[PDB]
Write a protein that binds this ligand. Sequence first.
Ligand SMILES: Nc1nc2c(ncn2[C@@H]2O[C@H](COP(=O)(O)O)[C@@H](O)[C@H]2O)c(=O)[nH]1
Lengths: 164, 164
Amino acid sequence: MDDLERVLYNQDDIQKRIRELAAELTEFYEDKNPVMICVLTGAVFFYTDLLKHLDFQLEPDYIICISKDLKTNIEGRHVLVVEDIIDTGLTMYQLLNNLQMRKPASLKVCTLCDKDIGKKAYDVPIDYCGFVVENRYIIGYGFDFHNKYRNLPVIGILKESVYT
Amino acid sequence: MDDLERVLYNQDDIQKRIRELAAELTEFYEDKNPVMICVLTGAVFFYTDLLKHLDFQLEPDYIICSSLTISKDLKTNIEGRHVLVVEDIIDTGLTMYQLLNNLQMRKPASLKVCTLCDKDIGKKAYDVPIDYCGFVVENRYIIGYGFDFHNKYRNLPVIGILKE
Ligand SMILES: Nc1nc2c(ncn2[C@@H]2O[C@H](COP(=O)(O)O)[C@@H](O)[C@H]2O)c(=O)[nH]1
């Protein structure tokens, strides 16, 4: 907590936003038996918290980028990619391009955070976004620094003095 | 929720147990920088909830397997590392017995098992050492809190029995 510069969002903020996102996703996916792709290892906290509010049939899958590909054939499937944060958009840009060639019925992105770096280098459509954050080192709620801080029940900023 | 024959443990029971387990784990793993392996997908809810209570440096890793086919192997070289396997439920013990044999060959410094549930089926086919266990469950099909049936029921905030 001493290494934390300031808190951007508290646990109450986080849970309220997750419930809102879940309701929005339910509106579109409830009837679609979507493949909900979790981008390991960063998106896990967000992913499970979302799944705790999705009261319908869905098929989990995981990807690491490809090091680990998808176990499900996504052709003709409604697919949702769950990500922790989008910075420049490079990874997502290439991810979507790859996945789009597999011919899914639909493909959308849901990210916990979108880093405000102004105009991103890659034009990535973000359909669902939890929060827009400052261009700083984000820490807490799954975000780590040297495998530390993931347990903090907030989304905050790491002091520069800690990593520089 | 109407497909539940009955609830075995509510969210309050689960959360209390997780805090107890986290305290127990900290005792041993605090200064060990362990590799905490989550056996996806069922164990993911339990896994992330535990990690929210672990206030020390640790390295997450994930494995996807079934009894033994490993669809997604570890990213981490566990040679000389302290390793904890986080599982959802141990039934006959076959899956964990094979997983442990595979992991022990990689030469970890230590290797322990943490399971959310242990299904009481009497003498198991394999004598799997369980170091940490959340609850002993009866010989029925368990549903909820990560446990699914045909890709349904994971979101339930309780651990319960699937109706016949
Ligand atoms: N959802 C759910 N999965 C179960 C149940 N019992 C065992 N499994 C799954 O079967 C495996 C354990 O079986 P074992 O190899 O011990 O017989 C684990 O993958 C576990 O998740 C149950 O009652 N409910």
